[PDB]
Structures are given as structure tokens and as C-alpha cells.
Amino acid sequence: QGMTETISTPAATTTPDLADQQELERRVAQVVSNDPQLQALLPDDAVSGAVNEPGLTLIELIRRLLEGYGDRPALGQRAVELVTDEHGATTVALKTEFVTTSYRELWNRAEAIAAAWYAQGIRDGDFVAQLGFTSTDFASLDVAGLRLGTVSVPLQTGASVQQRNAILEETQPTVFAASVEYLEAAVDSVLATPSVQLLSVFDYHPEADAHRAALSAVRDRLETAGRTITIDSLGDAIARGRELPAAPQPSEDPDALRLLIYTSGSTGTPKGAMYPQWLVANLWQKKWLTTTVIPSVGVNFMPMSHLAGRLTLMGTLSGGGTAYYIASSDLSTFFEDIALIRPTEVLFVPRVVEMVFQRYQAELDRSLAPGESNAEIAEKIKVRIREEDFGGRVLNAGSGSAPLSPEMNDFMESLLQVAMLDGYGSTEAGAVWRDGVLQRPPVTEYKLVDVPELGYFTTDSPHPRGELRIKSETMFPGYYKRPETTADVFDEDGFYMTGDVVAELGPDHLKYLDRVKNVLKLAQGEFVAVSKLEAAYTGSPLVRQIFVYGNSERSYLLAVVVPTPEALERYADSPDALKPLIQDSLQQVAKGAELQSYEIPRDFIVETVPFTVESGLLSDARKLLRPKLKEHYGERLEALYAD
Numbered sequence: 001q002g003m004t005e006t007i008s009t010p011a012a013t014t015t016p017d018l019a020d021q022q023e024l025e026r027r028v029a030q031v032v033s034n035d036p037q038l039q040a041l042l043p044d045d046a047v048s049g050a051v052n053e054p055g056l057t058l059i060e061l062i063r064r065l066l067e068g069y070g071d072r073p074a075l076g077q078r079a080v081e082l083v084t085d086e087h088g089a090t091t092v093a094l095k096t097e098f099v100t101t102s103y104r105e106l107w108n109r110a111e112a113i114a115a116a117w118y119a120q121g122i123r124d125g126d127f128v129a130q131l132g133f134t135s136t137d138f139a140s141l142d143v144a145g146l147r148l149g150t151v152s153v154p155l156q157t158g159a160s161v162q163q164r165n166a167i168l169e170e171t172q173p174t175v176f177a178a179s180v181e182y183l184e185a186a187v188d189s190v191l192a193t194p195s196v197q198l199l200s201v202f203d204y205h206p207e208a209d210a211h212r213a214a215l216s217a218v219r220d221r222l223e224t225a226g227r228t229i230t231i232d233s234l235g236d237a238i239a240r241g242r243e244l245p246a247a248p249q250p251s252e253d254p255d256a257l258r259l260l261i262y263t264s265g266s267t268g269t270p271k272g273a274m275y276p277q278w279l280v281a282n283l284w285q286k287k288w289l290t291t292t293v294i295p296s297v298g299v300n301f302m303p304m305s306h307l308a309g310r311l312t313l314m315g316t317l318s319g320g321g322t323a324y325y326i327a328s329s330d331l332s333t334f335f336e337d338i339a340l341i342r343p344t345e346v347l348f349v350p351r352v353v354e355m356v357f358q359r360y361q362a363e364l365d366r367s368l369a370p371g372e373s374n375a376e377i378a379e380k381i382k383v384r385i386r387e388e389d390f391g392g393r394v395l396n397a398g399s400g401s402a403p404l405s406p407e408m409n410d411f412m413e414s415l416l417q418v419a420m421l422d423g424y425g426s427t428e429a430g431a432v433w434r435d436g437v438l439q440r441p442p443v444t445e446y447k448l449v450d451v452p453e454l455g456y457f458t459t460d461s462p463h464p465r466g467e468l469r470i471k472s473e474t475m476f477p478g479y480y481k482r483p484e485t486t487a488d489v490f491d492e493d494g495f496y497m498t499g500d501v502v503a504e505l506g507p508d509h510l511k512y513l514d515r516v517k518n519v520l521k522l523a524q525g526e527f528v529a530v531s532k533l534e535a536a537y538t539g540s541p542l543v544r545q546i547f548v549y550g551n552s553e554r555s556y557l558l559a560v561v562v563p564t565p566e567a568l569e570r571y572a573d574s575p576d577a578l579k580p581l582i583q584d585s586l587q588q589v590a591k592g593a594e595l596q597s598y599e600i601p602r603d604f605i606v607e608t609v610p611f612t613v614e615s616g617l618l619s620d621a622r623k624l625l626r627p628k629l630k631e632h633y634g635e636r637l638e639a640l641y642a643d
């Protein structure tokens with residue numbers, strides 16, 4: 001593939017160049033020079049060379065990384081205090097500080113868990129279901145899996161019971177690991193899954209009455225079912241495992257399975273993308289899209305069931321950084337947390353960018369004043385958010401997993417004063433592009449394929465359009481126990497069919513348009529990329545979330561609009577008034593974005609209850625789950641069409 005390079009091949013497939021990445025290397029140097037924490041977190045090139053020695057097993061390179069960085073802080077989690085009220089009841093409360101686990105302590109805990117589990121009869125090749133958010137304990141379980149040679153199955157916490165149990169039926173795990181938050185759901189699925197011999201409970205504080213009561217109920221229910229099963233805290237497994245015989249070394253075969261990452265298509269049937277040893281190793285050896293070498297204080301806010309949660313976690317550790325956990329699965333502590341973390345690197349998803357923009361808009365509305373213009377006030381607010389909310393040390397930032405509007409790219413770059421990288425990739429393919437430019441490696445080949453029923457052709461003007469298809473060094477081997485499904489997503493020439501419509505701006509230079517299945521045809525022949533519309537309309541200060549909906553029988557669009565709480569409160573006493581103001585705001589967004597008139601929803605339902613991951617309307621990446629939204633709002637929307 002070096003021999004398919006041309007003079008038109010972007011350097012950006014390799015290197016990011018402009019006069020200023022001397023200015024960023026300087027700006028990085030400045031942030032480091034008044035910050036003792038950051039000095040000690042630069043990557044060690046001796047540890048990197050050991051980790052990248054060719055021919056290493058995955059456990060050997062994991063060992064060289066974790067033992068190599070030693071007592072360096074790896075994982076930061078918010079400290080907790082046990083509060084015992086005057087009645088005797090004890091709760092766990094967060095403290096306003098973080099504490100850390102070192103690289104070698106992570107390794108020691110992993111080896112202890114593997115020893116304890118092996119003594120409990122768990123073996124290399126067993127599947128391990130894991131139900132939780134993302135946390136230090138979860139990271140310990142993940143590395144423990146690599147050490148024992150099991151297959152991690154991180155389950156989506158918002159998935160239906162029926163589908164979770166079917167995944168359990170298919171993987172027959174011998175271990176079910178659950179954070180205390182999700183223990184009741186765990187017991188339901190353990191009772192349905194007789195293969196489980198061990199229930200391992202993590203993120204667990206037994207001195208808190210509620211955690212203690214959750215565990216007693218677990219033991220009560222599993223005993224009533226007559227289940228022979230070991231119920232064991234991760235903390236005690238670690239304590240006891242420190243003194244037990246070492247687990248045997250795990251299988252060495254690079255193709256041995258180590259992780260499944262589930263994903264759903266338009267059918268809503270999850271399928272498990274297989275991650276073998278060699279593909280897991282890629283996550284730990286190569287940070288997605290490095291702008292340049294920086295001390296890495298990162299933020300984990302995405303679940304371990306999603307690739308993006310692994311990109312921040314293993315990306316940060318790969319280069320000797322410290323990865324800090326958001327303390328709430330619903331992100332309610334997000335801004336309190338990052339103000340304490342003060343990260344140097346943030347990998348956003350669009351939903352979280354939209355939350356930051358809303359925070360800014362609400363602060364602006366509260367700060368309006370006759371003696372300064374909105375732009376003047378907005379500038380001061382951005383300084384404050386950049387310095388106080390984000391910590392003032394953000395040096396690298398980016399977004400991926402879903403499209404991000406040009407307006408939000410510009411806003412985040414202005415707010416954070418860094419370039420906002422756009423990272424496109426998938427669970428299946430791995431990393432595919434950076435700011436539109438195909439990354440070679442791992443990508444080796446791409447093409448676009450016409451989608452004539454959506455009006456996309458490689459001969460379109462000004463840009464070729466069609467479905468992106470790719471070959472890549474990090475292409476997954478397939479979906480677990482779904483060979484026909486896997487064959488179905490590779491075309492006759494072996495290209496992976498991304499299901500994404502793109503435009504080719506230039507050789508190796510692409511623009512995301514939408515999912516094939518997201519594009520709607522209106523009655524008169526127009527085609528609409530709904531997720532672009534949703535990204536634009538969400539930017540209205542009145543709008544918190546939006547779901548755009550159409551019917552090919554109709555000439556126009558509808559939507560479901562969740563207003564911001566500030567908007568609802570401002571018109572609480574004038575109910576009639578909010579809907580026409582939202583409509584006018586959509587019209588104005590459309591004119592600013594140069595959208596066509598058919599791209600403007602002509603009516604909508606006002607929803608006061610935001611879509612959530614817990615409700616199944618949002619994916620664990622907080623993207624819309626369109627079949628679930630059409631399942632939920634479809635009758636009302638068609639009734640809005642019909643009358």
C-alpha cells in the first residue's frame with residue numbers, strides 16, 4: 001500500500017502540518033511549566049519500546065505497560081465518605097477530591113482477581129458478563145480478563161431484559177460481574193442463566209446500608225432459587241487473591257477471543273463484534289489520532305460497553321497518562337468532576353458537546369446586561385467555562401461516534417482554544433479518519449458505492465457521493481456466532497460496507513453525510529439527512545434534544561422537540577407561547593445553515609421528558625435509537641400528519 005501512494009496522497013493520512021503546531025508545542029510547554037502534576041506524566045519512551053516489541057503476547061505487553069509505569073497514577077476516582085446520620089443510617093457521599101490507583105496497583109489487582117477467580121473454577125476461555133458503567137473496578141475486571149484469558153462481555157445497561165438474557169444464553173458465561181447500581185438487573189439475568197457459577201459485585205461499599213441491603217437481597221433471591229453460586233465482592237476477591245496461587249498464563253494465540261462489543265442495526269437485534277487478542281492490543285498500543293505528545297490527564301465518561309469508553313481509557317494508559325472517571329452514569333456530576341480533574345485531553349461525543357453549548361447558552365441568558373453586548377458577555381463566559389469548568393489545561397480535544405455540526409465545531413474551538421479533531425470510525429473497522437482524512441494505517445483501501453434510491457452517485461457534482469466501503473488492518477474478524485450476518489456486511493470484493501453515506505472532497509478526503517438508513521425521501525423526490533438536521537436544530541437555545549421524523553408519503557418533516565428546562569420554566573405560565581417560538585427558532589436555524597425549505601419541520605410534539613439511555617431511546621453512546629423513537633412516538637406523529 002506504500003506502492004499505491006501518489007503525489008495526491010494527503011500527508012494528513014500521516015502527519016498534521018501547519019506553522020502553529022510549533023505554537024501548540026509551545027502552548028503545551030507553557031501549561032507544563034507551571035504544573036508539577038503534568039511534568040511527571042509525559043510518556044516514557046523506554047516503556048513504549050518495551051510495549052511495542054514485536055511478537056509479544058497481549059498479556060506480556062500489558063504487563064510491560066503496567067509494570068513499566070510503576071507507581072505512576074493510572075486511574076483517578078472520586079473519594080467517598082461514609083456518612084452516618086443521627087439515626088444510625090449510613091450513606092456513601094462523594095468528596096470534593098479524587099484519589100488514584102497506580103499502574104502497578106492496577107496490575108496487582110488484575111492478577112489477584114485472576115487468582116481468586118481461578119481458585120473458584122473460572123478458566124481461560126470462559127465468557128464473563130460485566131454490567132456497570134465505567135470505573136476503576138471495571139478497569140480492574142478488564143485487565144483481569146486479559147490475565148485469565150476470559151472473554152469480557154460488557155453489557156449495555158439500557159438494553160432490554162429479553163435481549164440481555166439472549167446474549168447470556170448465547171455466551172453461557174461462568175461469571176457475572178455487576179456494580180451495585182445494577183445488582184437487581186444482574187440477579188434477574190443470573191437466575192435466567194444457569195451457567196453462571198460466580199456473581200462478582202463491584203463499585204461496592206458494604207458499610208453503606210443501601211449497598212449492604214442490595215447484597216442481602218441478592219443472596220436471598222439466589223438461595224430461594226436453590227442456586228449453587230458464589231456471591232463475592234470484588235474487594236474481597238482482590239484481598240484473598242493476593243495470597244492465592246497465580247492463575248495459569250492465558251492462551252497465546254493472537255486470534256483468541258478477549259472481548260465482545262455489542263452493536264445494533266436497524267433491526268434492533270444486537271450482535272457481538274469479536275475482539276481477539278491482536279485487536280484488543282491495538283487499543284492499548286495506539287491512541288486514536290494523536291495531535292502531538294502531551295501529558296495526558298483524560299476523562300472517562302463513556303461506558304465500557306462502548307468502544308469510545310475504551311478509547312479514552314486505554315488511550316490514556318497507553319502513553320503513561322492518568323485517566324479520571326466521571327462519578328455519575330447519567331453525567332449529572334460531569335462539570336463538577338471535570339473542574340476537579342482539569343484534563344489535558346477530552347474525547348467528546350456530540351451529545352456532550354451539545355450539553356456544554358447549552359450550559360453556555362443558559363449562563364449567557366442569565367448574564368444579559370445593558371452595558372455590554374451579548375458577544376462581550378459571551379466571551380467572558382467562554383473564558384470562565386474554559387478556565388473554571390474545564391480546568392484551564394485542555395490541550396487536545398476532539399469528537400466522534402456521531403456527526404458534529406460546523407457550528408458546534410466552531411463553538412468548541414472558540415471555547416477551548418484548541419483544534420477540535422473529528423474522529424470517524426466504528427466498532428467494526430476501528431479508526432478510519434481524522435478531520436476527513438483517511439488514516440493510513442490502518443486503512444488500506446476505500447471506495448464509494450452508488451445508492452441510487454437515495455440519489456447518491458459517484459458522478460455527483462460538486463462531490464462524488466455514495467456508501468463508504470473500506471479495507472483496514474484493524475477490521476474486526478466478524479460478529480460472534482453470526483457468520484451469515486458477517487458475510488452480509490462484506491461485499492463481493494471483500495470491502496466492509498460501513499452503512500455510512502459520504503462525499504469525496506478529494507483523494508483520501510471525505511465528508512460524512514448520514515447513515516444510509518437515516519436518509520429520508522420526501523414525497524416530491526427530495527432526500528433529507530436527518531442527523532444533520534438534528535445537529536443543527538439542537539443548537540437553538542430553546543431546544544435541548546430533537547428527533548426529526550418523516551413519511552415518504554408526505555411533502556414535509558415533523559419532529560419531537562425536548563425544550564431546555566430554562567425554556568419550559570420561562571413559559572410555564574404562558575403554555576400556548578412556547579411552541580410558536582420553537583417553530584420560529586427552527587426557521588432561523590435553517591436560514592443560517594442555508595437549509596432548504598423542505599428541511600424545516602413544519603410541526604412537532606413538545607416532549608418535557610428528555611430521552612435517556614435508561615429508557616432505551618438513546619444508545620450507550622447517547623445517539624438516538626431511531627427504531628425505539630419511532631416505536632414510541634410514531635402513532636402521535638402520524639396522527640399529527642393525518643389531522
Ligand SMILES: Nc1ncnc2c1ncn2[C@@H]1O[C@H](COP(=O)(O)O)[C@@H](O)[C@H]1O
Nearest residue numbers: 263400401402403423424425426427512
Ligand atoms: N466522527 C464521526 N462522525 C460522524 N459520524 C460518526 C463518527 N463516528 C462514528 N460515526 C457513526 O457511528 C457509527 C459507528 O457506531 P458504533 O459501531 O456503534 O460505534 C459509524 O458508522 C457512523 O455512522
Ligand SMILES: [Cl-]
Nearest residue numbers: 160162163268
Ligand atoms: Cl427490545
Ligand SMILES: [Cl-]
Nearest residue numbers: 372373374375
Ligand atoms: Cl448584543
